[PDB]
UniProtKB/Swiss-Prot annotation:
It is found in: Nucleus. May be required for DNA interstrand cross-link repair. Also required for checkpoint mediated cell cycle arrest in early prophase in response to mitotic spindle poisons. Possesses beta-lactamase activity, catalyzing the hydrolysis of penicillin G and nitrocefin. Exhibits no activity towards other beta-lactam antibiotic classes including cephalosporins (cefotaxime) and carbapenems (imipenem). Binds constitutively to TP53BP1. Binds CDC27, which is itself a component of the anaphase promoting complex (APC). Binds PIAS1. The gene is DCLRE1A. The lineage of its organism: Eukaryota, Metazoa, Chordata, Craniata, Vertebrata. It comes from Homo sapiens (Human). Expressed in brain, heart, kidney, liver, pancreas, placenta and skeletal muscle. Coiled coil: none annotated. This is DNA cross-link repair 1A protein.
Length: 341
């Protein structure tokens, strides 16, 4: 049964609620983004209207085979009427196709559902500038002050400079990057651009990327592994055993691997600056963990909420323990007392 924080009151709508069977009273199912914990339950046998971005709808049709007659893509930044209710989709600064949803309820209440997001000051100049929000359904993934990490731009600078130095020192080094979902494509795209290479990958991953409306993508990626010196592999293979095994398959073209694991936050962020990050090494294999986040830091989250000044917050992440719920409620009250709303 569908939990309360996935239902939008005063509407027939749910958000990211496909794993509960037929939800009583639901006339339209919204999907914020194509990540498995959020789409859990969708397939070619789904027969209710799904509302989403264009990129999410391309993934639903090609990867999950949802029939076309049930996919309702909406443009961004544009007032739309759905089942008698005004809605707007906004860019979430998460993975490709990820949105936040503004709902203008028939009684005058305004709700913002962030989906998953990485808050940014640019959101202060979206269509949010113009009006009051009563209720905020908030991605609270990193809602505690210990969660610090650098800007995506600083992380990419470190990656590009590391890869270029290594391959210039040894033209026979291969670069490998891990992945297990959409998101974080700038990591492997930026490294391949500095090296003058396309990115090589499986047919299954190439198919996924072809759904994402990335400009000039045909110029940037390939299934011909032999033509490429930046390879994508499943995240599970980014370990000394899996990398050794991969290097064997490359027919003596290469004699070294440099590999990247984009994670979110890790407790080494408590101590080490991005500039000082070092790899784990075994023989001719080095592995870097890089803190590339597609979720708000604590400070970015706090800035957004103190600007928006919502009357009520409903967290959508870390909701399963009393300790997590009490910690988040304490920070929401701090924020409200500090800013005066
Ligand atoms: Ni996500």
């Amino acid at each position: 049964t569908c939990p309360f924080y996935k239902k939008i009151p005063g509407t027939g709508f749910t958000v990211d609620a496909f794993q509960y069977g037929v939800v009583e009273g639901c006339t339209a199912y919204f999907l914020t983004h194509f990540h498995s914990d959020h789409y859990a339950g969708l397939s070619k046998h789904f027969t209710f209207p799904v509302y989403c971005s264009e990129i999410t709808g391309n993934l639903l049709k090609n990867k999950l085979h949802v029939q076309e007659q049930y996919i309702h893509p909406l443009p961004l930044d544009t007032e739309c009427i759905v089942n008698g209710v005004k809605v707007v989709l906004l860019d979430a600064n998460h993975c490709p196709g990820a949105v936040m949803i503004l709902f203008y309820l028939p009684n005058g209440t305004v709700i913002l559902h962030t989906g998953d997001f990485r808050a940014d000051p640019s959101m202060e100049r979206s269509l949010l500038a113009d009006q009051k929000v009563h209720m905020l359904y908030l991605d609270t993934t990193y809602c505690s002050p210990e969660y610090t990490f650098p800007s995506q731009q600083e992380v990419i600078r470190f990656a590009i400079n590391t890869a270029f130095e290594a391959v210039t020192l040894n033209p026979h080094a291969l670069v490998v990057c891990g992945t297990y979902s959409i998101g974080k494509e700038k990591v492997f795209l930026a490294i391949a651009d500095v090296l003058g290479s396309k990115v090589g990958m499986s047919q299954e991953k190439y198919k996924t990327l072809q759904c994402l409306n990335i400009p000039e993508i045909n110029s940037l990626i390939t299934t011909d592994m032999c033509s490429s010196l930046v390879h994508l592999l499943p995240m599970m293979q980014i370990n000394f055993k899996g990398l050794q095994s991969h290097l064997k398959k490359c027919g003596g073209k290469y004699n070294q691997i440099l590999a990247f694991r984009p994670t979110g936050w890790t407790h080494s962020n408590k101590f080490t600056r991005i500039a000082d990050v070092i790899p784990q090494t075994k023989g001719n294999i080095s592995i870097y963990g890089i803190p590339y986040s597609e979720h708000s830091s604590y400070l970015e989250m706090k800035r957004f909420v103190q600007w928006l000044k919502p009357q009520k917050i409903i967290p959508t992440v870390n909701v399963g323990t009393w300790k997590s719920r009490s910690t988040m409620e304490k920070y929401f009250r701090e924020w409200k007392l500090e800013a005066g709303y």
